[PDB]
Design a protein around this ligand. Structure first.
Ligand SMILES: [Ca+2]
Ligand SMILES: [Ca+2]
Ligand SMILES: [Zn+2]
Ligand SMILES: [Zn+2]
Ligand SMILES: [Zn+2]
Ligand SMILES: [Zn+2]
Lengths: 142, 142
DNA sequence: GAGGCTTA
DNA sequence: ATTAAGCCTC
DNA sequence: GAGGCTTA
DNA sequence: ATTAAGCCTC
């Protein structure tokens, strides 16, 4: 446990980043969500408080398509567009025509999220997800 | 049958594009392959002649991952980066660390090709491909 | 008729 | 990261 | 400590 | 098209 200078929550080391950012993963994902929604013209019905309760804690997070844990995904050393090492799971607007909301949000790893893109429906992606999980299972990753 | 001003082959309408380009799909895919290989620093052991025999004809082409026919893929109205309507299947460098060669080339639709990216091996992608095929099968597409 | 491009 | 068809000179 | 970014 | 963590002002 230490304290996030932003939400002031008391959190385990696994809720924080490994590089030089000081805010927690929930705070950072919330700042990204709001900036992305504005830029992309998506609606956002989450408040920070509902989002943070929705996002939960690092050891409980798994991609809702492939099942990979947040630590497992971290171990793949994927890079974001900037491109720094990706260390948390993000949110998929499961209906890609709708915005951010509790009803429309689904936790997804950045690999599944980009695969799904705006091409596959969430149920089509559930089936892709199972195939992706076999890749991970084969690589010795959970 | 009409004649491609480039390879001078006598070809069915389905070997040609629907927009304003005059060269056949084989010729265009060959010009793309050579330009992309140069730009990306990939080797290319195909000659035009071996490539054209490898690429075959439109009605015989199916993605080697998801099984979608070239006409089926055309019916999805995907756009290339330019972005015009995609009307043929391309080649996947199945080992993404190696270049273009008969041994390393595999026919793939642009959807499977981008999914695979440099993330999945060809055998991991075979399993993703089967899941993608179910999406198509469900959409009434072959 | 060929060349060089821009990037979901 | 993976490519792909029409445009706009030459 | 918060803001605005660039894009496999 | 889909997003995501560190940098560099403020
Ligand atoms: Ca999504
Ligand atoms: Ca490929
Ligand atoms: Zn926080
Ligand atoms: Zn996933
Ligand atoms: Zn030709
Ligand atoms: Zn395919």
């Amino acid at each position: 446990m230490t304290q996030c200078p932003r939400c002031q929550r008391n959190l385990a080391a696994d809720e924080f980043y490994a590089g030089s950012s000081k805010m927690c993963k929930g705070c950072m994902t919330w700042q990204n969500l709001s900036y992305n929604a504005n830029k992309e013209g998506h609606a956002n019905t989450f408040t920070k408080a509902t989002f943070l309760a929705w996002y939960g804690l690092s050891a409980q997070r798994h991609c809702g398509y492939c099942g990979i844990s947040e630590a497992g995904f971290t171990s793949l050393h994927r890079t974001n567009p900037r491109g720094y090492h990706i260390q948390c799971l993000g949110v998929d607007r499961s209906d890609s025509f709708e915005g951010y909301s509790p009803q429309n949000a689904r936790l997804a790893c950045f690999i599944c999220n980009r695969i799904k893109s705006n091409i596959f429906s969430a149920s089509e992606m559930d089936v892709l997800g199972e195939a992706i999980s076999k890749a991970w299972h084969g690589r010795g990753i959970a």
